[PDB]
């Protein structure tokens, strides 16, 4: 009872997040050689769908780092906030694989 599926393919790794700051953070994956390109990383503020949406708009950005690098700074963040993050393996063209890792900035001195 199986149809069968061999294929070898490089992939992500946990993509986890160190040295939470406030407003700020790093994250850190494992990717083979040759994997991909560069990695495009977007962060966007995770709103509930149960509520309704902010009348203010709230700019999207990323980061460009190469396969060679598996690194991600984010700045400007909210205080005490989680931010979905999800990274995207560039083989070229297009995005051939997609991590989701998830963060809960620090809560320090700031304003609003």
């Not at 599926?5 to 986890?16: I, K, M, T, V």
């Not at 990383?41 to 780092?65: A, D, I, K, N, Y």
């Given at each position: 009872?199986?149809s069968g599926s061999?294929?070898?393919?490089?992939?992500?790794?946990?993509?986890?997040?160190?040295?939470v700051?406030?407003?700020?953070?790093?994250?850190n994956?494992?990717?083979?050689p040759?994997?991909?390109?560069?990695?495009?990383?977007?962060?966007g503020?995770?709103?509930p769908?149960?509520?309704?949406?902010?009348?203010?708009?709230?700019?999207?950005?990323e980061l460009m780092?190469?396969g060679?690098?598996?690194?991600?700074?984010?700045?400007?963040?909210?205080s005490?906030?989680?931010?979905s993050?999800?990274l995207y393996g560039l083989?070229?063209?297009?995005?051939?694989?997609?991590?989701?890792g998830?963060a809960?900035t620090?809560?320090?001195?700031?304003?609003?």
């Amino acid at each position: 009872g199986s149809s069968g599926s061999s294929g070898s393919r490089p992939r992500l790794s946990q993509l986890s997040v160190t040295d939470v700051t406030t407003s700020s953070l790093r994250l850190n994956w494992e990717a083979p050689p040759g994997a991909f390109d560069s990695f495009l990383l977007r962060f966007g503020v995770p709103s509930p769908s149960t509520l309704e949406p902010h009348p203010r708009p709230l700019l999207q950005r990323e980061l460009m780092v190469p396969g060679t690098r598996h690194s991600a700074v984010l700045r400007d963040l909210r205080s005490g906030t989680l931010y979905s993050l999800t990274l995207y393996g560039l083989r070229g063209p297009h995005k051939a694989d997609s991590i989701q890792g998830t963060a809960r900035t620090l809560s320090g001195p700031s304003s609003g």
